[PDB]
Design a protein around this nucleic acid. Structure first.
Lengths: 50, 107, 87
RNA sequence: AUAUUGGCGAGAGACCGAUAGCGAACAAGUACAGUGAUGGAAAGAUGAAAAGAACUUUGAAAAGAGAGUGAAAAAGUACGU
RNA sequence: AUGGUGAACUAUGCCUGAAUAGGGUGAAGCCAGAGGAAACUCUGGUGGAGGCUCGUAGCGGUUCUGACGUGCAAAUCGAUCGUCGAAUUUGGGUAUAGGGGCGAAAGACUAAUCGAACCAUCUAGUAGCUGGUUCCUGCCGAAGUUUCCCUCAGGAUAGCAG
RNA sequence: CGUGGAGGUCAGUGACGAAGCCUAGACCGUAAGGUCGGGUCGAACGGCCUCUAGUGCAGAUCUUGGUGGUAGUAGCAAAUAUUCAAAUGAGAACUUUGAAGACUGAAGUGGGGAAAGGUUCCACGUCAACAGCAGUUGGACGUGGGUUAGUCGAUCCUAAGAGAUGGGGAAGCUCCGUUUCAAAGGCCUGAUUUUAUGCAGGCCACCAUCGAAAGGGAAUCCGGUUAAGAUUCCGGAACCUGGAUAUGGAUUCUUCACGGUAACGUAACUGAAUGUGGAGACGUCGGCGCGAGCCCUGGGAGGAGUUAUCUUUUCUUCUUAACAGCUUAUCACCCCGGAAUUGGUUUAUCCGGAGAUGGGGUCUUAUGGCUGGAAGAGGCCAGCACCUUUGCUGGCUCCGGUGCGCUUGUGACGGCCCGUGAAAAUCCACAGGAAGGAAUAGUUUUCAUGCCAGGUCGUACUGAUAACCGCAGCAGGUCUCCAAGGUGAACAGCCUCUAGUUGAUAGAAUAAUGUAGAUAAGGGAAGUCGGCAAAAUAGAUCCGUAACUUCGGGAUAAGGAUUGGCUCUAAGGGUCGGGUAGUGAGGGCCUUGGUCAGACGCUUGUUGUAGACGGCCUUGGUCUUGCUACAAUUAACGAUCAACUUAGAACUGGUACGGACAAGGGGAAUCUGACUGUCUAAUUAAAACAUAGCAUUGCGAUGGUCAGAAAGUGAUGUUGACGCAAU
RNA sequence: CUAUCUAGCGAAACCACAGCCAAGGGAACGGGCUUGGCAGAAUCAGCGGGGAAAGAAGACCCUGUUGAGCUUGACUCUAGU
RNA sequence: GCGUUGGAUUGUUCACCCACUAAUAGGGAACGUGAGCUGGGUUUAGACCGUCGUGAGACAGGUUAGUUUUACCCUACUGAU
RNA sequence: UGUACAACGGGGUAUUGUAAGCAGUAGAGUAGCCUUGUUGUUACGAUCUGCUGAGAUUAAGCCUUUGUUGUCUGAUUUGU
């Protein structure tokens, strides 16, 4: 919100790091049952609510 | 080739808006190579991007039209849509009348 | 309009992040978090809500101290160092 | 000597078998909805072993037809039956 | 019934700021002139008042009972409308909370819900009242009648039946 | 009969193949069902004697999941818009570029933000999915980059209010109050030379904390630079605060300054406790004066446009910041002087013996002017050639005018009130006199200069008929600054310049019935519950206007006459000048000589150029004047300048003229509420509520009304009968 | 501008099964029962009679020994005084 | 077989008048006809007056204001292949 | 391959209402000037007149046409 606060920004910086797909190596791991990033967050469909 | 970025950049370096920047299509081969303001800047001096000089808004009728009114034309009852006070308030006419009486007596 | 046209007049915030649990239940005007309670000296947990208590009891975090307490008593709260037996 | 669906450590059953059994056999108090107290799911089984398809051809490719792998792909990852 | 949450919507008060083209009408006060003996009275200028007025921005919405009415829309669009410098419109902070708040009152508003909020627990609340009530074959096989009951869309007793 | 499991048994069946599933193939039983054959398929299962139960299915507007007909149908129709060519691409009504045609028309479909969103910002590559058509395009996908602060804000103060102590309640979670029944604090001088900082006195008493990134607030701007940043980065130029130290100046044996009669001034020109004063600090409306930005416009220096004909034509550049020196206004005040024959004076009538008019000065410095910053900056143009990285040489960047013009700021005012329209931090000043001080120098760090530091947090983008909220990219809602030209009263409607879009599925005929615009001969409300919808007048100027009344209104009542264009007429202002002859300056003194700053400019010197043709003196023809004269005055005149407003006269147009837009139907009455106003936000805007007015009631606080579970608790009450409370 | 046709996209409401009538009886105004009339693919655009069409286990009336709001010389209590 | 009207009042069924005309006859079809229209009346909720009730409220009382939705199905009908 | 057809053009019919340009001692008049006038012309001047009873349009569902140019064989289907 332009004139933000560090508490809010520290949370947004956390969101940016976790807004990524799986690196390809994950799918090749032994006994892997994970195929997609179920925690994906986008700015259109869902809101963070800080 | 997508030239949207170049049109945006050319607008800022020249100063005028995007409606007065001219990026010809005959040599568009190297326009897309310009991915920087310095690259666009040399594209202006050589003659690639002309300034597309401003559209004329000539107030020639108005100067003649206002000339007619100053002569005493278009001053009839059918040329007026407001009361005689909206056009020229009686207060101003009174103020213009006092301030010349006050100074004349003082003079 | 009590419906859609009145849902666009809401751009303020009533609650905000709770400095103690971070659940965004800290009422601004009331200055009291509605989920745990702050800056009250006690975390609110009512017996009429059992799912809510189950969401914040021991086991939902890390247990930075109690994961070792069972192990520490598992031997008898020894202190010092270890000896050399063989190999 | 008495009680103890909480905590730890164990042994069991004419119990349930994954639309059942705890809400959750799975990154389950998770995603998500609500300004809030709160509410809250869906999701198991390719094959013994990826050996998960070299290479030929068509197509811009996605893919198809062959070939090949594999007992078997009427097992090819949108994969037991 | 118990215990908690809610005035970011709207209801009211306070603190703090912000917004309201252009015309009409014309009050005091003032100036000059005229009349008359006085009392005083008329004429002509300013003057801008006035919870006034025509009318944009804004706020509501009267009518077409128009459009739509599985819509752009859980109430919107178009025309026609009332008001528009004030018991005006509104931002932010704050205060008032459930049989309690607030109400220029309409039982109106209280975050699509209110002549009585939302959430969780008691709670699988109680129902003489509707609905459903999951395989075959064989044998027997009825009643809507007596008496009593605040009893007559129900029971108990006797009867019919196995 | 059948289903999930348990005990026993058939040494039961079985990957040369169980279970499960399919099978208008066969057999048995009346039936519940059981057996076999074939295909599919790969790990367990069956018969019998018993036991056990979460044991049977068609529906309970039954739970979960899935799929149908409807159906390839309804529909993808508001916001006046599209077309051609090339490029890319396998694949263009939609991507890009170019050329047209339009729209928003500057209360934007433009530029920035508050809340909100959180990387949507920018670059590369890319189309499985989303963009209800498509798509090599994207606010989508994968990978990366980007937010720079002593000055902008948060930080600090306090408002309405929240709330911790001491206390008092409450079994208690906690409630009351927050300065009240609390002995609640640090602070300058001196001691110094173990005193580190204690100690001996002068002292003051406030009395937690939080609470408004549009309330108060110490200090900065310009040029330029990224793919995305800037008042933050580069360059240049500032100012503020905290601190340390000197240099320079003033002060002084009249030891802590002078001048002016005075308002006051001079860069400095001692000074504590305590007290006082000012700023912060501030209602709304109306007109007037002045300033800035913009608008209009003349001359000149350049560029671009038209040029069948005409136009000394049209458009465009000509700009100057924060900060600093000098200077500048109303208002206000000071010295002389003294007033009626009362006078000054604003658009708006206030002032004057509590002392005017007049003459002379002081002050605040908003604003404005010259200069420095700063023309080496930016802008408009000509030559040079660099696949390039790019620059050099260069010219101008100048002088004006007007205005009820719009926006805005400010000043002196006037109107309004039973509303007279915030606090504190902070900063400064005055009274006071403690304390210290001279020249052999002591102060002076609120005089000039010099030195150092300014910590943390935010800075990207949207801010909306695609970035926020309405399940969605939903015609809804959301606070604010800037805003041009013309017609026109106008921020009205209509067209355009800057800027931005050209976006919301398309192609062809374009049946009915529709939605939205319209037009209809004669009559005319005969229609309908009701002229409901449409229609007419509807701008401006002149004439004229009744019943009634609370005398203010009704009333633009009702009802009549004109409106275009060309050529004219008249009226409405500003600024300057009220003489001749001799005389002094003709404070321009140009002109003739040069005297010598007459010099730069066109590494010493060669010798070449102008002296900038200018300080300094002239024998001079060189339109302001003090003196005398005629006699000085009337009539008033003459010269320049640039605005619109009003009225009138002829002519003219197939009698058209508010020619588009814009824009009141009117009158006689009746019922009822006095009026302005308010409510059933989503079917009732009303004669309903409210309002002023009137009347009644309670109450003199050890009280009246009301709250609380108590309280050493509160609301009225920061109140007092002309008040509060209930009607 | 739709409606119409075409290129692309592409639901919902509703659905015992389906859809030609007269008369009769019938739960006494059924498309299907009976008796007669009649009946020839596939369909397209309108239309509105009907399917007692759709939307909600009628907001009217009654019953229930079902409630709620309000009122009072109903009954029983109660904070306050 | 054919024709049975135009108007004032009332929401009006009804009724009474004006007038023409040859005449202004009675009726049924879910008291024909609202997915044909209108909403004038009765019929939710606002409000006023009179009577009744101590009151909240009651009245064929009188009066004013009061969102009326969907066919993109089958049949029937109107046209077409 | 036809006095065929089509597109232009021509003529007719019709709507319309008298243009573009030049010229005019037409023009309410307004002012400069020079030989200063017995129309003095220059500049402006709504409008009017003469060619202009013209100009424009004339078929998309008007009529005719020997004139110029151009076209005349693509696909599918059918038997007792």
């Amino acid at each position: 919100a332009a004139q933000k606060s560090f508490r809010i920004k520290q949370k947004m910086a956390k969101a940016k790091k976790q807004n990524r797909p799986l690196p390809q190596w994950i799918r090749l791991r032994t006994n892997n049952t994970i195929r997609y990033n179920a925690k994906r967050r986008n700015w259109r469909r869902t809101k963070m609510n800080i | 080739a997508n030239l949207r970025t170049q049109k945006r950049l050319a607008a800022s370096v020249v100063g005028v808006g995007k409606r007065k920047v001219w990026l010809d299509p005959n040599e568009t081969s190297e326009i897309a190579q310009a991915n920087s303001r310095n690259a666009i800047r040399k594209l202006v001096k050589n003659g690639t991007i002309v300034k597309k000089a401003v559209t004329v808004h000539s107030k020639s009728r108005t100067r003649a039209h206002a000339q007619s009114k100053r002569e005493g034309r278009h001053s009839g009852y059918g040329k007026r849509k407001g009361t005689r006070e909206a056009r020229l308030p009686s207060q101003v006419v009174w103020i213009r009348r006092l301030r010349v009486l006050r100074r004349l007596l003082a003079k | 309009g009590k419906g859609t046209p009145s849902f666009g007049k809401r751009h303020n915030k009533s609650h905000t992040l709770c400095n103690r649990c971070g659940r965004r239940s800290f009422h601004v005007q009331k200055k009291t978090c509605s989920s745990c309670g702050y800056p009250a000296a006690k975390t609110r947990s009512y017996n009429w809500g059992a799912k809510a208590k189950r969401r914040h009891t021991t086991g939902t975090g890390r247990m930075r101290y109690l994961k070792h307490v069972s192990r520490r008593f598992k031997n008898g709260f020894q202190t010092g160092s270890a000896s050399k037996a063989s190999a």
